[PDB]
């Protein structure tokens, strides 16, 4: 099988460790790195490569991402080109993707995915314990959108639909390559597209639980996620009219108790986030708010003078979400900035009224939120 590591600016020592772990595994036929550009990281990998190819007997290739879609060129081009390499230049049955910056990686990850495919699954996704203030795009954008748009489907039940640790069978890789909406999705929206399309195609899905957890970057304010946010939301919005034709077998390994060191992390700088909410305003943003419900309109306007976010509760976010589905314009800086601030207030509301009540309370809240959104969407 093919194990792929997409990379951009990673410390190279860490990546090559994972490549070496992957190269040593008995069920791996070939490791492949797919890079952003020929940079400091890329060269270091190209050099270290054929040494590991012979020390383990497994072919390790480096290659550059090919421009395959119509959007900012990012992770999506990277994964879509690995898809092309996999399908056009190898005969392997299965392809793994793992993020290049994992520090807790080991052979079990590959073993567990492989064995679940043996069992008959077409797609295996890995999922991880997360802190209560992590994954706010996952929860407030992707899972929320899936739930409001396709409440009867398996979409909103996928644990980590932005997750880049997965395994596909060859015909799943092929079905996704042949898909226009997917090929197009060159930016951060790629994971959303893989998730939506594998589910809508009735691929059978298993989710393995990785107790180690995954290690996330040091955080400032939420603005470190602004681009991801805009792109993840545009992906959902671009699918809003699609129909999901058929059901899917979907099963998930029972999760362990969250490790204490993961429960006890804080995901982002609150002070910086509150500050950033008062910046980058334009009169056009003020006027664009006229499209939103009165409490959201006056709440966000208040942020010009002091931080406000009590108003952005669950119902207010659902109403806000529908307005954005209809009126948000990808690439319009004022829409991107409003999206970003609206979401910030949602994250802050959740953090102070829910996460602050404790880990268990927050988990329970997030699943119940999805359930209320689904029930509401099915009513309309
Ligand atoms: N080829 C390619 N890989 C990327 C790009 N952007 C991110 N990656 C890789 O995709 C993975 C996720 O990136 P990262 O910044 O760690 O995102 P996060 O883990 O979701 O916070 C890492 O393995 C990155 O090296 C890109 O534009 N092209
Ligand atoms: Cl996320
Ligand atoms: Mg990461």
Nearest CA to ligand 1 atom 28: 75
Same-domain status, 52 and 110: yes
The three-state secondary structure class of 358 is coil
The answer to the question of whether 216 is labelled as a binding residue is yes
Ligand found nearest the CA of 131 = 2
Residue bearing tokens 């400032």: 220
CA-wise closest residue to 90 among 183, 173, 2: 2
Same domain as 146, residue 287: yes
CA 196 vs CA 165, 179, 205, 235, 254: distances in Å: 16, 12, 12, 10, 23
What CA dihedral angle connects 52, 56, 59 and 65, to 10 degrees? -50
Residues 121 and 186 in one domain: yes
Same domain, 317 and 202: no
Taking the centre of ligand 3 as the mean of its atom positions, its distance from the CA of residue 102, in whole angstroms, is 7
Residue 2 dihedral angles phi and psi, to the nearest 5°: -90, 120
Is the separation of the CB atoms in 4 and 82 below 8 Å? Answer: yes
Give ligand 1 pocket residues (Cβ under 6 A): 6-8, 10, 34-36, 65, 74-75, 78, 99-101, 164, 217
Dmax over Cα atoms in the chain, in whole Å? 65
Which atom of ligand 1 is closest in space to residue 15's alpha carbon? 23
Atom 18 in ligand 1: which residue has the minimum CA distance?
A: 216
Could you tell me which residues come within 8 angstroms of residue 145 by beta carbon, excluding any fewer than 6 positions away? 233, 236, 321, 325
Beta bridge partners of 252: 207
Rounded to the nearest whole angstrom, what is the distance from the C-alpha of residue 141 to the centroid of ligand 3? 19
Sign of the CA dihedral with 316 first, then 322, 323, and 329 last: positive
Residue 195 Cα to ligand 3 middle (Å): 18
Q: DSSP characters for 214-270?
A: -------SGGGGHHHHHHHHHHHHHHTT----S---EEEPPPPPPPHHHHT---S-H
- Residue numbers preceding breaks in the chain (C to N > 2.5 A): none
**Domain with 185 in it:** 1-128+163-214+244-255
Nearest-CA residue for atom 12 of ligand 1: 99
For residue 99, give both structure tokens: 């993020």
Domain boundary, last residue among 232, 255, 278: 255
Would the annotation count 136 as a binding residue? yes
Q: How far, in Å, from the CA of 367 to the mean position of ligand 3?
A: 24
The conformation of residue 378, written as its DSSP 8-state character, comes to: H
- Rounded Cα distance between 149 and 115, Å, is 33
Token pair for 351 = 């953090």
Shared-domain flag, residues 149 and 208: no
**How close is the Cα of 224 to the center of ligand 3, in Å?**
13
In CATH, what number is assigned to the domain containing residue 105? 3.90.550.10
Q: Whose CA is nearest to atom 4 of ligand 1?
A: 75
Same domain, 234 and 170: no
The verdict on whether residue 217 carries a ligand-binding annotation is: yes
* CA dist 199 → 3, 156, 245, 304 (Å): 22, 10, 9, 41
Q: Residue 30 class from Cβ within 10 Å (0-12 exposed, 13-18 middle, 19+ buried)?
A: buried
**Nearest residue (CA) to ligand 1, atom 7:** 75
Which ligand neighbours the alpha carbon of 164 most closely? Answer: 1
Say whether both 157 and 169 belong to one domain: no
Residue 265 annotated as binding site: no
In ligand 1, the atom with minimum distance to the C-alpha of 78 is: 1
Length of the chain: 380
CA angle 274, 279, 284 (to 5 degrees): 130
SS3 131: coil
- Identify which of 5, 7, 44 to mutate to test ligand 1's pocket (most ligand atoms within 8 A of the CB): 7
Do 121 and 76 share a domain, yes or no? yes
Query: How many domains, the chain?
Result: 2
**3-class DSSP state for residue 354?**
coil
* Residue ending a domain, choose from 255, 281, 308: 255
CA pseudo-torsion sign 160, 24, 18, 133? positive
Experimentally, how was this structure solved? Answer: X-ray
Residues 224 and 168 in one domain: no
- Asked if residue 101 belongs to a known ligand binding site, the reply is yes
Cα(346)–Cα(343) distance, integer angstroms = 5
Task: List helix spans (H) across the chain.
Answer: 12-24, 40-55, 75-89, 107-118, 136-137, 144-149, 170-177, 180-183, 190-200, 226-239, 260-263, 270-276, 283-288, 294-302, 314-327, 333-353, 359-379
Q: Whose CA is nearest to atom 6 of ligand 1?
A: 75
Burial of 293 (0-12, 13-18, 19+ CB in 10 A): middle
Residue 179 annotated as lining a ligand binding site: no
Span from the CA of 8 to the centroid of ligand 3 (angstroms): 11
Region of residue 280 (phi > 0: left; psi between -120 and 50: alpha; otherwise: beta): left
Distance 103 CA to ligand 3 centre (A): 10
Residues in a beta bridge with 168: 95, 123
Q: Whose CA is nearest to atom 11 of ligand 1?
A: 99
Closest CA to 218 of 269, 284, 165, 278: 269
Cα(236) to centroid(ligand 1), Å = 20
The verdict on 146 and 102 lying in the same domain is no
Based on the fold, state whether residues 295 and 363 are members of the same structural domain.
Answer: yes
Contact 267, 359 (CB under 8 A): no
PDB resolution in Å: 2.5
What is the Cα–Cα distance from 211 to 256, expressed in whole angstroms? 7
Q: Of 255, 285, 318, which one is at a domain's C-terminal end?
A: 255
- CA–CA gap between residue 200 and residue 126 (Å, rounded): 19
**Does 226 lie in the same domain as 348?**
yes
Give strand pairing partners of 35: 7, 64
């Amino acid at each position: 099988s093919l194990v792929v590591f997409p990379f951009k600016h990673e410390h190279p020592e860490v990546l090559l460790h994972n490549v070496r772990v992957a190269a040593a595994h008995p069920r791996v036929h070939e490791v492949l790195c797919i890079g952003y550009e020929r940079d400091q990281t890329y060269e270091a990998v190209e050099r270290a490569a054929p040494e590991i190819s012979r020390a383990t007997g497994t072919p390790v290739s480096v290659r550059l991402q090919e421009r395959l879609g119509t959007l900012r060129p990012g992770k999506g081009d990277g994964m879509n080109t690995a898809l092309r390499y996999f399908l056009e230049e190898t005969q392997w049955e299965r392809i793994h993707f793992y993020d290049a910056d994992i520090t807790s990686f080991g052979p079990d990850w590959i073993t567990k995915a492989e064995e679940a495919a043996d069992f008959g699954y077409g797609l295996v996704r890995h999922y991880f314990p997360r802190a209560s203030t992590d994954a706010m795009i996952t929860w407030m954008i992707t899972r929320t959108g899936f739930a409001l748009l396709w409440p009867h489907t398996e979409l909103s039940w996928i644990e980590q639909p932005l997750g880049g640790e997965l395994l596909m069978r060859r015909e799943v890789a092929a079905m996704l390559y042949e898909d226009e909406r997917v090929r197009r999705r060159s930016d951060w929206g790629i994971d959303t597209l893989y998730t939506f399309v594998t589910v809508a195609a009735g691929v059978s899905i298993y989710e393995c639980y990785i107790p180690e957890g995954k290690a996330h970057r040091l955080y400032g304010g939420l603005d470190d996620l602004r681009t991801m946010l805009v792109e993840c939301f545009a992906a959902i919005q671009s699918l809003q009219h699609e129909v999901v034709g058929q059901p899917a077998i979907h099963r998930q390994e029972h999760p362990h108790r969250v490790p204490v060191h993961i429960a006890e992390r804080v995901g982002y700088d609150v002070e910086a986030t509150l500050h950033r909410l008062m910046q980058h305003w334009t009169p056009r943003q003020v006027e664009l708010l006229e499209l939103f419900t009165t409490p959201v309109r006056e709440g966000l306007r208040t942020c010009q003078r002091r931080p406000a976010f009590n108003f952005m509760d669950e119902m207010a976010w659902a109403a806000t979400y529908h307005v954005l589905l209809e009126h948000f314009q990808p690439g319009d800086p004022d829409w991107e900035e409003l999206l970003f601030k609206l979401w910030t207030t949602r994250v802050l509301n959740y953090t102070m009224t829910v996460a602050l009540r404790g880990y268990d309370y927050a988990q329970q809240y997030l699943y119940r939120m999805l359930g209320r959104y689904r029930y509401q969407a099915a009513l309309e």
